[PDB]
Amino acid sequence: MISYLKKAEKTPQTETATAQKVVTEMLAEIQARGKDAVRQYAKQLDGWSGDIVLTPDQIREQTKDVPAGVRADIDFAIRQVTDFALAQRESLKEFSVELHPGVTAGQRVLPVNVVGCYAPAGRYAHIASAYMGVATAKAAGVKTVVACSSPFRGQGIHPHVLYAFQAAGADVIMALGGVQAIASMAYGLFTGKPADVVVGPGNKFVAEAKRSLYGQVGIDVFAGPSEVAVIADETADPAIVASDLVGQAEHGHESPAWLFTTSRDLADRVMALVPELIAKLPPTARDAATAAWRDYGEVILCGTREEVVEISDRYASEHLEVHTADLDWWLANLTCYGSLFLGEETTVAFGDKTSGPNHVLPTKGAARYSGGLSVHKFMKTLTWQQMTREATRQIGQVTARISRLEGMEAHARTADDRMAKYFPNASFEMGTPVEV
Amino acid sequence: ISYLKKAEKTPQTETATAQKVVTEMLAEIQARGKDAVRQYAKQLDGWSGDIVLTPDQIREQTKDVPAGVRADIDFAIRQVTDFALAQRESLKEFSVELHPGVTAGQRVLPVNVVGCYAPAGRYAHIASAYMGVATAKAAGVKTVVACSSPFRGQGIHPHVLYAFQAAGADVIMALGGVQAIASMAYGLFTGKPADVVVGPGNKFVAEAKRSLYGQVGIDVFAGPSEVAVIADETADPAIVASDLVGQAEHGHESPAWLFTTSRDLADRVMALVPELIAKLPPTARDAATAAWRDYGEVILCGTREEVVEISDRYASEHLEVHTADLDWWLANLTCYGSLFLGEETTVAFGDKTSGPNHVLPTKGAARYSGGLSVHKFMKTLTWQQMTREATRQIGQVTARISRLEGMEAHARTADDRMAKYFPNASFEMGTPVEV
Ligand SMILES: NC(=O)C1=CN([C@@H]2O[C@H](COP(=O)(O)OP(=O)(O)OC[C@H]3O[C@@H](n4cnc5c(N)ncnc54)[C@H](O)[C@@H]3O)[C@@H](O)[C@H]2O)C=CC1
Ligand SMILES: NC(=O)C1=CN([C@@H]2O[C@H](COP(=O)(O)OP(=O)(O)OC[C@H]3O[C@@H](n4cnc5c(N)ncnc54)[C@H](O)[C@@H]3O)[C@@H](O)[C@H]2O)C=CC1
Numbered sequence A: 001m002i003s004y005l006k007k008a009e010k011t012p013q014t015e016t017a018t019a020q021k022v023v024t025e026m027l028a029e030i031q032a033r034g035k036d037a038v039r040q041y042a043k044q045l046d047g048w049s050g051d052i053v054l055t056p057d058q059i060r061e062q063t064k065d066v067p068a069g070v071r072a073d074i075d076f077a078i079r080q081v082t083d084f085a086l087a088q089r090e091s092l093k094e095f096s097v098e099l100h101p102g103v104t105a106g107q108r109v110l111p112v113n114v115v116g117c118y119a120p121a122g123r124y125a126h127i128a129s130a131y132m133g134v135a136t137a138k139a140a141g142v143k144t145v146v147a148c149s150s151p152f153r154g155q156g157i158h159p160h161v162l163y164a165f166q167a168a169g170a171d172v173i174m175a176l177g178g179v180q181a182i183a184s185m186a187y188g189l190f191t192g193k194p195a196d197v198v199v200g201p202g203n204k205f206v207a208e209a210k211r212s213l214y215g216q217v218g219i220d221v222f223a224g225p226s227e228v229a230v231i232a233d234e235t236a237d238p239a240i241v242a243s244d245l246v247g248q249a250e251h252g253h254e255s256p257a258w259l260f261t262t263s264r265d266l267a268d269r270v271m272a273l274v275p276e277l278i279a280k281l282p283p284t285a286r287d288a289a290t291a292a293w294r295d296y297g298e299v300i301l302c303g304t305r306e307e308v309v310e311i312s313d314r315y316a317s318e319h320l321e322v323h324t325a326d327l328d329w330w331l332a333n334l335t336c337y338g339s340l341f342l343g344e345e346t347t348v349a350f351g352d353k354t355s356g357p358n359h360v361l362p363t364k365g366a367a368r369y370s371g372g373l374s375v376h377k378f379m380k381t382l383t384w385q386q387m388t389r390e391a392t393r394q395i396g397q398v399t400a401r402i403s404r405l406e407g408m409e410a411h412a413r414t415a416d417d418r419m420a421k422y423f424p425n426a427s428f429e430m431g432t433p434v435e436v
Numbered sequence B: 001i002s003y004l005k006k007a008e009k010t011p012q013t014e015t016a017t018a019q020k021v022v023t024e025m026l027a028e029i030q031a032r033g034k035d036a037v038r039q040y041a042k043q044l045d046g047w048s049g050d051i052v053l054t055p056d057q058i059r060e061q062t063k064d065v066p067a068g069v070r071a072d073i074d075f076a077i078r079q080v081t082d083f084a085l086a087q088r089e090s091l092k093e094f095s096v097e098l099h100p101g102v103t104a105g106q107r108v109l110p111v112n113v114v115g116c117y118a119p120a121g122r123y124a125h126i127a128s129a130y131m132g133v134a135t136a137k138a139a140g141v142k143t144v145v146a147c148s149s150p151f152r153g154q155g156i157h158p159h160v161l162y163a164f165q166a167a168g169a170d171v172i173m174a175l176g177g178v179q180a181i182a183s184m185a186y187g188l189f190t191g192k193p194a195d196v197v198v199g200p201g202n203k204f205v206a207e208a209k210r211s212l213y214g215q216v217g218i219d220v221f222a223g224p225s226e227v228a229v230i231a232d233e234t235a236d237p238a239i240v241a242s243d244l245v246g247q248a249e250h251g252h253e254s255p256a257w258l259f260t261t262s263r264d265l266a267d268r269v270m271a272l273v274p275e276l277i278a279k280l281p282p283t284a285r286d287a288a289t290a291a292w293r294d295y296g297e298v299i300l301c302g303t304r305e306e307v308v309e310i311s312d313r314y315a316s317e318h319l320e321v322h323t324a325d326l327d328w329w330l331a332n333l334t335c336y337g338s339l340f341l342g343e344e345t346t347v348a349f350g351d352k353t354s355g356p357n358h359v360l361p362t363k364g365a366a367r368y369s370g371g372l373s374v375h376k377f378m379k380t381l382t383w384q385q386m387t388r389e390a391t392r393q394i395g396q397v398t399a400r401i402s403r404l405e406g407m408e409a410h411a412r413t414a415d416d417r418m419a420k421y422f423p424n425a426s427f428e429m430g431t432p433v434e435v
């Protein structure tokens, strides 16, 4: 038996209907009206009536005052993300194999042509998100990267976001936010370069827009309001656990922070500390985190490690920290999470900004079926095959027979035609011809 | 570049029709659950019986499937499995050191539950039944649920059923169409919602899967079958024409495309295709006549490079190459579902028994994905671990960037570690955020 010491009124699912209604209306307008609707939304939602595509010269002008120390930090983080991305790239190989004798089959691994990357800017300016998308796309060998971020605080793109996009290798940069940005990248509005894949994190509207546009484009994953889970035993430090939960709760009113523990004492101290830490935050963060903890935060006490694994796997958190003994066991036994942080020393914020692994990660249970943005999301794994004539003796008769069982005579005739051309003297059973 | 035959319709033509039906049906199933599904099954497919088949039913319904049939299906399952296991070996786990003391790695883990759909309407898709289930089993998925439409006012086609059973399905349901995809996504009738739903189908099936993405993962948008052939002057028109017709019989919406550098070849094929269609039995003849007329296209190009450009833009589900210098085509083509190099292999071989999966992207989805494979059932997740020493650099960069973004609570998680691990250290952690 599992005890909820803190139960949330709301979950990542609560706001689904609200997001869907807005996105349905906006995507309909943009499909009908194109750039006209996008310019309208940019003005009405973001107060923006400037040009949307930045020229190379505006990019230089807008970043000319970014200090050396800020550039050095962003450059370091880009290098870490690139290093890990290149290691991930090496993990997926091309190959060919012989199947039935004379049947050669293989796998080609090819980057997509055009990627659109979104970096959010609303409550905060997402400098790290800006290099997470673009640097990964460049590591994957994508030749055209289009990047968008929302106009921020009465100006255009945040200068540090813009520096990140430029340093990471973006080919085209647009001052454009939200659903209208996602849609513009999917349809190639303003650039004439429709994306093959659109990636990047955002609020519930951004995430729903990407989900809805799937099919028009590929995507990385459903990457909506941030979530954090911590697994802790009696070895954990409640002050650090509480700090880590509050860390992601500041993202917004809808960010869940989950604690799964085998220690009642830990649970109690964390529940006492989280409100105290929230109260010491500055206004924007305090507003977000107070609501998020109240409405979405949960604390679950479990009897055994196996019970913790079961609940953790069901929650399928974007981020999972593990502050326990015997970390090898947790790495071996946990199966549903976006990104795993083993031990107290690393933490979600480190992964968010500069550890290396991508931060763009599944939310709302998408970790049941996908990991996060990676080079893998920009590669197509395509198959090819080639046969000797000899291989077609077996392959062809099996194809003709199965085809005819299914009722597909024209399929069987492509096998009959090869058998008659290559082996006119053979007499295999090719199945009773279909008559209806 | 010149169109010798231009289609009135494309894969895009019927999108609105599909989306309207799917939106209505999903809204109804979300409201009324199993009852909505049982009603759709009755009205659409004539079905009143039990939806979940019992083991006794499965055995009873397959008891007369002959040895010769079983041997062919078993052979095809082996080829699909062999290629799937090769694909599974191509994606590895690893760990690496980044900044000194930072370890990061990739875990590759199968999903828990897969739902597989095998179509049955115009034809009964025996091969489709093992393409999904066998691949899921090769990936190490523990629970596989399989559905196929009640066929012609009776139950699941017995050979589709045999295929599901022999390929390793854990649960089999007699359920078709949108109501099948929805039932597997939501775990109706089994209590086991799928993590990933896969499999091909008509425009309604494919749209239902596209719509339910998010609730579940999917393989790919896999709608009405498409075929493209690239041919030069060395190609045999009789075989090209045959191959086009072969997939045209799938239904009235199936495009058959010919890209060639030889006007002679194009002309002979355009004469032959109608003649071959005319010789088909009634159901196929009806499908292929409409498909070729409405969706068939023939494009003449001046250079190989032009062919590549056009082929890549069409991004066909299946692409056959009947040319000299096949190495060049393998090296230069980039958008297709599955490639058939040389005259000897052909799409129907891939459909039934070559090995590589036939469940493939249509309507331009080959621009961003390959087909169903074990890779669609594996999650690639990341993990990391650090020494305390590593956090001196990582932590100060985190704190500074966080504060530049306006994220003070993020920075405090770094400040807290620095104060705990290195209480005498003094770093630039960034100006605290005040708004
Ligand atoms: N899953 C992941 O990996 C990550 C998720 N995130 C999440 O990204 C989110 C960022 O959210 P925001 O600050 O809002 O930035 P955002 O860039 O996602 O959204 C700002 C844009 O949304 C539009 N918008 C806002 N409310 C709207 C409404 N009612 N109707 C239509 N458009 C509307 C704005 O006008 C603007 O164009 C946070 O929830 C954060 O946790 C952040 C990083 C990574
Ligand atoms: N992309 C790929 O890899 C593959 C594609 N396919 C395609 O699969 C398709 C199979 O189509 P079908 O024979 O129809 O079998 P299906 O199993 O896809 O469709 C039959 C189901 O659809 C329902 N349905 C039919 N019309 C409907 C309507 N108007 N409204 C609501 N429900 C409706 C039926 O009642 C039944 O439940 C073909 O187009 C074939 O080319 C087949 C194999 C692989």
Ligand SMILES: N[C@@H](CS(=O)(=O)O)C(=O)O
Residues within 6 Å of the ligand: A126, A128, A129, A225, A226, A227, A248, A318, A352, A353, A359, A360, A361, B410
């Ligand atoms: N924690 C965010 C990343 S960031 O803090 O916005 O950089 C996420 O959900 O990945």
Ligand SMILES: N[C@@H](CS(=O)(=O)O)C(=O)O
Residues within 6 Å of the ligand: A411, B125, B127, B128, B224, B225, B226, B247, B317, B351, B352, B358, B359, B360
């Ligand atoms: N040609 C079908 C496969 S099958 O002929 O239905 O077996 C496809 O589109 O993949």
Ligand SMILES: [Zn+2]
Residues within 6 Å of the ligand: A226, A247, A248, A251, A349, A352, B410
């Ligand atoms: Zn964060």
Ligand SMILES: [Zn+2]
Residues within 6 Å of the ligand: A411, B225, B246, B247, B250, B348, B351
């Ligand atoms: Zn076929």
